[PDB]
């Protein structure tokens, strides 16, 4: 029995939510159930609407001032609760019993294929609120929906839509390429793989690279990089890349020789703090959050969904230096991308509010 109460700046309205992280099972999102406690004497026959909002915050580089972010709604839901016109939940029943008759429950259904709470990593020169997808619960006292919402009689509470790692392990990632360098002498074979499909945050990613060279060229270097893909659709569908981990190895493969090694790299935020625009997980206010989890989407998906979609790939690159007709300045790189899932496993308690200086 632990619930969150936030009163209005004056103190008449108060929202009561049980959770603040609502797990998005791909079929259905957990209902945003709550309870609003009102004071008829102050309201004077007004209404108490409760709004659930999904808003994409963004910045402008044209403005002379800095930190002036904006908001761009992509889901709005409204519920009138004081004149009530899908029964209550056990938590709602308990709150109503403990608060009497002047507590009026509300519930929200978040439709599937909505974005999860993602925060883009702000730069060090930024001084405003971060960008990304943020949810919010807002209850206010207003006679009309269109009437101005004076902040004195409204309560804004941030909530996070989250996902957790699927229980069933997926197929092992694996890719292979063959490249011929304008000679057709023999195929340069590259094969890479990862041990598993789903990785938890902080765990090492074991890349088993297997190069089988048959050509007459020398593989100078092998670079393994973990890259984060962010599909942001704020105004037009875009795509971004960011290496969150990288291993540069001087391992050399001679012609007609095979090379096998297992490279281990771990993505983490310590070495990626200066990358502005990096996708992190949703932030309640301004706490430290890990790299954004992979976005799980339905097998039958509407696609092109708004907000930010996070993906991760491991890239292995062979830097082959051409010989016999150049000064080794040219380097025809053969490469391979392997996708994997980076999530948290299903918990048994609330994620946040553990440690704070």
């Amino acid at each position: 029995t632990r619930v969150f109460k936030k009163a209005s700046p004056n103190g008449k309205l108060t929202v009561y939510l049980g959770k603040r992280d609502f797990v998005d099972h791909i079929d259905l999102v957990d209902p945003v159930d709550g309870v609003v406690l009102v004071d008829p004497e102050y309201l004077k026959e007004r209404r108490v609407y409760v709004t659930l909002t999904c808003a994409f915050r963004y910045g402008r580089e044209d403005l002379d001032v800095l930190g002036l972010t904006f908001r761009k709604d992509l889901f709005v839901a409204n519920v009138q609760s004081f004149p009530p016109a899908k029964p209550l939940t056990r938590l709602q029943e308990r709150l109503i019993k403990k608060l009497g008759e002047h507590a009026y429950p509300f519930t929200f259904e978040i439709p599937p294929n909505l974005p999860c709470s993602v925060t883009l990593q702000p730069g060090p020169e930024d001084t405003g609120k971060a960008c990304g997808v943020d949810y919010e619960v807002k209850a206010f006292c207003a006679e009309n929906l269109e009437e101005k919402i004076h902040k004195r009689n409204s309560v804004r509470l941030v909530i996070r839509k989250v996902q957790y790692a699927p229980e069933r392990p997926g197929p092992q990632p694996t890719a292979e390429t063959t490249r011929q360098f304008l000679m057709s002498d023999k195929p340069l074979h590259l094969e890479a793989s990862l041990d598993k499909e789903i990785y938890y945050h902080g765990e090492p990613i074991s890349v088993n690279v297997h190069v089988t060279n048959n050509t007459n060229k020398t593989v100078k270097k092998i670079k393994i990089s973990v890259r984060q893909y962010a599909d942001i659709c704020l105004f037009n569908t875009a795509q971004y890349k960011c290496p969150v981990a990288m291993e540069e190895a001087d391992d050399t493969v001679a012609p007609s020789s095979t090379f096998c090694k297992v490279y281990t790299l771990t993505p983490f935020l310590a070495n990626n703090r200066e990358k502005r625009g990096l996708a992190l997980d949703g932030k309640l206010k301004h706490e430290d959050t890990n790299l954004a989890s992979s976005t799980l989407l339905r097998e039958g998906a509407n696609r092109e969904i708004l907000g930010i979609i996070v993906s991760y790939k491991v890239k292995v690159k062979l830097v082959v230096s051409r010989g016999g007709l150049l000064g080794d300045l040219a380097s025809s790189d053969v490469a391979v991308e392997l996708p994997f899932t980076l999530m948290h496993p299903k918990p048994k308690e609330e994620p946040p509010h553990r440690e704070v200086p």
Partner: antibody, heavy 120, light 110 residues
Framework: EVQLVESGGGLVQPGGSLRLSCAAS????????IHWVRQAPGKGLEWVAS????????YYADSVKGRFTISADTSKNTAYLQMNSLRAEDTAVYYC?????????????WGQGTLVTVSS | ASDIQMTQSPSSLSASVGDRVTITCRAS??????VAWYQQKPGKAPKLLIY???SLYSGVPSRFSGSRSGTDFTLTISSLQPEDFATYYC?????????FGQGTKVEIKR
Amino acid sequence: EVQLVESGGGLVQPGGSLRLSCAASGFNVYSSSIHWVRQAPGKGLEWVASISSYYGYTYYADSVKGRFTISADTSKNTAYLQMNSLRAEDTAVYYCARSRQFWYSGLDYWGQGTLVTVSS
Amino acid sequence: ASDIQMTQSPSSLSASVGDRVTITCRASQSVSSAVAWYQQKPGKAPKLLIYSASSLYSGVPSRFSGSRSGTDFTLTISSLQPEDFATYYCQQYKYVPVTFGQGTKVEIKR
């Protein structure tokens, strides 16, 4: 097998230096935090230093900040603690403990402990 | 939170096999449910008993149970065995200067 093995504790001169090492096993330094907790002979538990190593954080006690320094070596999966300007009140049995990095605390794994004796 | 004192009420406690004992700790300031409990045999490393002020760590026998009421916290041993003679520490982990309780020695009486 998840275990922490400590080393480097021993008798030193007052004002000297020491370097305790916590050789972790069975877990990774990026998915867990490493903390140093000491217990004076016949006294209670006390937290000294901690390192996150995923967010690159290092925390020290109010009486430890200006002398101690905790560090993590990912290659060997080991954490250290540089104890300097040691005084009399630094005598204790020092334990290194593991905590889950992501949304957990309560030190679920502990080392055996190494007694650090600081007397002239 | 300048500093938080995890004051355990009983310093020494005498009990018998099969008895029910309770150890109460008071925080100097609200720490939410960020409280853990440890069992330390003499000359050994502490063992985590319960965390989140109510949640039982895996492998710890069900006779141990913790519960929060307010700024106070409670660890319960129901029908304590002879293998429960130890010192019990309460730790709040809500803030970086993590503080433990003074400890409570639970001894067998006769």
